[PDB]
Symmetry: D2
Subunit: 268 residues, 4 copies
């Protein structure tokens, strides 16, 4: 039947219909998953985006920087999925970095106040969410987060790479904690996708030739990747997140699955 | 079903303990039409495979034999019907002479023996890919079996060196397979109690090496955040099926760790 | 002498147990003219450093303080001489509030505390590099202290996350330093018995974390093919000096493992 | 001098372009007493090694030859004097037949050729270590030459597979050498324009070699934060000397990257 048939999954990180989280939600719904969605700040606006999804799913406010939002989260999810019901999956598709820590802005010129906000949202929050939702999760469950390979330094990504490095390490500790509940915790290291964060927020930080800079990335990535890569299609990444939410990778935890077309395994 | 309407070649079945036996079993449970290859003890392999959920054709394949590999693509077509192609290939073949493993010192392994080991455990992954890529479908997958060789461990000795060579081979195969729209990956499994494994644990290859593997196993389940049961090959078989499916479409030249998460934990 | 006629800034001396104390000692033994930075307890730091082979100027430096970093380059030149530049910088600074390490649960660390930890242990490496690269000579070297964070270990918790962030910071610093002809590297040391470490082993931060560190040490010496004596910081200090010298000229944005070889061995 | 009063065996000199020639030169400049091993073209090697800063004995050594390896330890003692031991061994031996490396397709390499390559490039590191560890001093060092095989690159094909196998062999040698107080490491050099390399690359690119080598040279220099000059083997030779010295005493079974830091940068 459906890959995620009869599974209750919380999905965070939907802002646009371009968002990786939107496509994860779409593919999971196509596979018979009952979703619960998280939104940040503009909640009346996110509802209009999620209305374009295959099916109706409850939407909850969640600012990961907000301690009251996280404390109330587990209870708010239960009132949304029914008492005596638990989650089978959690998707962390949250990332942020102030522009001072991106693009052409010099690496040394990023104030720690900005880098800290970035690390809080992009890495610390993965642990914040896991703490908040593990009590309402089922043994056999899965936590999946989004990653960009930070093992080698790349220009323009700067302090966002540092937060991804921190995230990769956070995921390994979460794995230990989640393990006590019979829950797996993994990251999907995706290749580039023309989402809003990329196209607009990262693109903004690149200056005059930003457009060709982003196009050169797709071209070089499609080149390295033995099976090619399309920055305009989030479906391969969404499918990979669903594979992790399913019961088909049962002995995989505290790990990184590379959904990048195989570009990381190739030098040229 | 997960592998519904998929033609998959599975190699490496010798016992009902074999990782390939469990891959075959789970694949069949998921609606896959299999083709099986066997080495040397074919009478026994028929007998073993007869206990699978469904009947699947069995073909002779010694990876060291050039005539066997040259005829392989044609023999598979004659078994799956003309104008039909494979959607998956499972390489679950491994070998290392007794001199290259266990209590026998690392330096006392003759190159003739280490070479046989490398031929079968690593070079053969490329031999099979060359042989079967022409009869594969775009969207298909090649999956091989691996043990994490990034750190040196006692007793595994020269098999670690063959698995290191294999990890590298897999990355070149991905380039070649990529031209056909085929993915190539390895599943890095945790220690599994096959017949050889439990014989070695019973100090067959030697007592010092016997307790070594036993410490490895106990250590693996401690380190693994979700635990590791070396008496259950089903998590590994399920992971190979995930790779054969259409659910990891952007993953190639890679290693998926189906080891209970132990490679990520120091203690 | 290995570092003959070299001006090196050394940070991170607080006791005679400090890895920075031994780096300073070995560097001085090799003909290096040092400049030392101290944090908060300067009266004590003056007093410790007085027991070094030679007299070296001591400067106040809180990496969390923006005024301290802005004035740093000037203060160093007032200490080494006008028209003189540094040939080396040693970052031996680390910190993590008690809620981020030890027996305290991983999930119970407030971000305010984790942030302080990351600021001092990782961000500061970039803060120091920004501050001192203008007063550095082409051929120069920046060396930082690291603990291998690639695998998660109990008790280290959020200090591991800061080390992971540091490894990444070092790779970007490498790019920046490269413009000045300066190398940037980290020395991944094995566990060393500092006063802090010796305290934890005595169940200061809780018996469960005390036993954990003891198993870590015991395991490290087993794994290390040449052994690991956590009561001897001299091998680590010698490794930092090799990086400060002109003998690893093509090595930048990297990690040198001074851990007895433990990271390469599974058992 | 860095290697003052040290007896070092150096293998792999064939041309004045050879990485082993530059290691020998720098080691001699630092006060090392050398012993040289040569293969096949000994008449030519003698003439080349006369152009070195000092006279060093030359011994025949085909790593494929079992009689050569069995007699090696005795031949070295007869050359360095009885009761004297080696403090260092340099393995700068590599080989891959045309079919396994170049413009020839990955799948078109016969195993007979790939096996010769693996024997010489990887297995030999263990062969030499077995042969010379009995005549080595505690504190001693074995150093081998490696090209980063972690990611697959075009043309390098099976030489990458042998480098992968080598990285793993070095980790096992590290365990064996550890029993004698000997360290075992690899230097992961960036591309060096040696005569062997020029022909390998030159032969692969055909007529279109000019422009492509220029982009390749420019590519390395960009990626390397401190730059990379293929015409200069001195940074690599200096790095091998740092490993032969007493300045990296707690580093074994490891890889030191002398590539200008190119491996740490994505672009
Ligand atoms: N686009 C790529 O190339 C790419 C590649 C790899 C990984 N990623 C990762 O995928 C994830 C999603 O990014 P995307 O590219 O889909 O773009 P996006 O714009 O859709 O995602 C950013 C999301 O983070 C949320 N967010 C930010 N701060 C928050 C806070 N304080 N509390 C709650 N939510 C907050 C935003 O509301 C938004 O939905 C991120 O983790 C990103 O780093 C993106
Ligand atoms: N058992 C474990 O703990 C474990 C863990 C990780 C990986 N593996 C790997 O999984 C694979 C399967 O091993 P296993 O543990 O199931 O043991 P196994 O003995 O059941 O499987 C090895 C197979 O290789 C076959 N083979 C040997 N020489 C051959 C040749 N010349 N031509 C063709 N086939 C040949 C054997 O007949 C056998 O079927 C191997 O690659 C092994 O290295 C095993
Ligand atoms: N001890 C080990 O086992 C070990 C192993 C590997 C790496 N390390 C690393 O080596 C470094 C030194 O640690 P150590 O073991 O010598 O202990 P330590 O306590 O002697 O060193 C840490 C130093 O950080 C300094 N510091 C703290 N806050 C500061 C601030 N705001 N500004 C400037 N300096 C500040 C302290 O004065 C102290 O000198 C740390 O980065 C640590 O992570 C330690
Ligand atoms: N040149 C580069 O760009 C580069 C980069 C990284 C690593 N390396 C490595 O450096 C080493 C030296 O390579 P090079 O570029 O100086 O080329 P080279 O041809 O000058 O050196 C290789 C040596 O191997 C010897 N050799 C071959 N077969 C032998 C055998 N059977 N027995 C004994 N010796 C044998 C040759 O006589 C020769 O001296 C090799 O291990 C190579 O893989 C080279
Ligand atoms: C753990 C692992 O990889 N095991 C392999 C080892 C090589 N091999 C084997 N070798 C000799 C006799 C029978 N089998 C197959 C199983
Ligand atoms: C091995 C390691 O990382 N050690 C560090 C830990 C953090 N730190 C510290 N934090 C608080 C009090 C004193 N020291 C410095 C030493
Ligand atoms: C970069 C690298 O690994 N270079 C090696 C390759 C193998 N080799 C060689 N192979 C065939 C003929 C002569 N030399 C020596 C140089």
């Amino acid at each position: 039947a459906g890959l995620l048939d009869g599974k209750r999954i919380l999905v965070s990180g939907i802002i646009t219909d371009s968002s990786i989280a939107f496509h994860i939600a779409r593919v999971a719904q196509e596979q018979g998953a009952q979703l619960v969605l998280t939104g940040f700040d503009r909640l009346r606006l996110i509802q209009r985006i999620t209305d374009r999804l295959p099916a109706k799913a409850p939407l909850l406010e969640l600012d990961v920087q907000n301690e009251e939002h996280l404390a109330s989260l587990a209870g708010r999810v239960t009132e949304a999925i029914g008492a005596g019901n638990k989650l089978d999956g959690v998707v962390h598709s949250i990332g942020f970095m102030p522009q001072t820590g991106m693009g052409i802005n010099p690496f040394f010129d990023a104030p720690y106040a900005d880098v800290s906000k970035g690390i809080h949202i992009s890495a610390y929050s993965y642990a914040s969410m896991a703490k908040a939702l593990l009590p309402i999760m089922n043994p056999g469950g899965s936590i999946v987060g989004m990653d960009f390979d930070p093992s080698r330094a790349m220009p323009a990504y700067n302090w966002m790479t540092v937060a991804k490095s921190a995230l990769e390490s956070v995921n390994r500790f979460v794995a230990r904690e989640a393990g006590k509940y019979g829950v797996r915790s993994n990251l999907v290291a995706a290749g580039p996708i023309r989402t809003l964060a990329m196209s607009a927020i990262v693109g903004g930080a690149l200056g005059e030739e930003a457009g060709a800079q982003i196009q050169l990335l797709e071209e070089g990535w499609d080149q390295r990747a033995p099976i090619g890569w399309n920055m305009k299609d989030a479906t391969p990444v969404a499918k990979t997140v669903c594979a992790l939410l399913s019961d088909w990778l049962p002995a995989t935890t505290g790990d990184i699955i590379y959904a990048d077309g195989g570009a990381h395994t190739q030098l040229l």
